[PDB]
C-alpha cells in the first residue's frame, strides 16, 4: 500500500493525518509509517486511514 518514494527519508512534516498499519500501530502520518519501514527493515501495509480500531 504506502508509496514511500513520495517522502524524504530525512524528515517528515508534523501534521497529524493518522494511518493504521498492518502491525497494529497507528502512525501519526504516512511519512512516519514510511520511516518505520526503513528503520525496522520490514514492509508495513496500511489497513485503513485514521487511527487503528481496538479489537
Amino acid at each position: 500500500t504506502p508509496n514511500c518514494r513520495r517522502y524524504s527519508i530525512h524528515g517528515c512534516n508534523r501534521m497529524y493525518a493518522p494511518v493504521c498499519g498492518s502491525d497494529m500501530s497507528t502512525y501519526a502520518n504516512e511519512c512516519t509509517l514510511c520511516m518505520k519501514i526503513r528503520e525496522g527493515g520490514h514492509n508495513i501495509k496500511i489497513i485503513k486511514n485514521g487511527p487503528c480500531g481496538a479489537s
Partner: protein
Amino acid sequence: IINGEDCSPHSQPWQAALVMENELFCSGVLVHPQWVLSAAHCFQNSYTIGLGLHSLEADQEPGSQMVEASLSVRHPEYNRPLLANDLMLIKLDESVSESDTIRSISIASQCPTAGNSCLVSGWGLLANGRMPTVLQCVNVSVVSEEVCSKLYDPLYHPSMFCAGGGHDQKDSCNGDSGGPLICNGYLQGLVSFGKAPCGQVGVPGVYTNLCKFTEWIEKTVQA
C-alpha cells in the same frame, strides 16, 4: 509536544487549533485579528479554527471562538525544494474580537540566535504517543545552522532552522505542525518537520524560519 507540560490556561492566546471531522491536524498562530499563519503543509480548501482554547472542547472554555476561513495562500515557493518555505497565511472570514484569551503576536524580523531558549506549544502527540487534554508548552534551544545543515543534509534550506535536540528530549511532534516557536516574546518559527520518533537525543526539530518571510507576509496582509 514531547516532555513539556500543561501551558498555564490561556497563556498562549495567539494559538489556533486547525480541526476537521472533530480531529486536530495542525495548529496556526493568530498574527492579526483577521490572519492566521500556519505551515503550508496544513493547507485545506476551507478551515474551522478554534481560538481561545485550552482543552479542545469549545463549550467548556469561556471566551473561546470557533471561526471560519475560506481563503488561504501558501508561500509561492513552498515545497521547492522539498520541505522548504513551509508557511501559509489564512484569512479569516471575519476579524476576531481580541480579548484576554484571544490575541495576536508579533513576528520577529531578526533571525534566530543559536543558544536562545524559545517556547513551543501545541496539542500534538506526547512522549508516550497519547494526545494531551490541554495545550502543552515546552522550551527548546536554537542550534546553529551548521548543526541544522549536517543533521538534515541535503534537505536543509535557509527558510528552516533547528531547535531542541537536547539530552532532555524536549521537542514538538506530530499534530504540532503550524504552531508557534516564541523567542523573547516574538514569533520566531512555526513547527514544520522532524524525524521519527520525535524527541530523539541529539536530533533537533525543524521550524519555518519566519525572519526570511517578513516582506512576503507584510505584502500579503497589507494588500
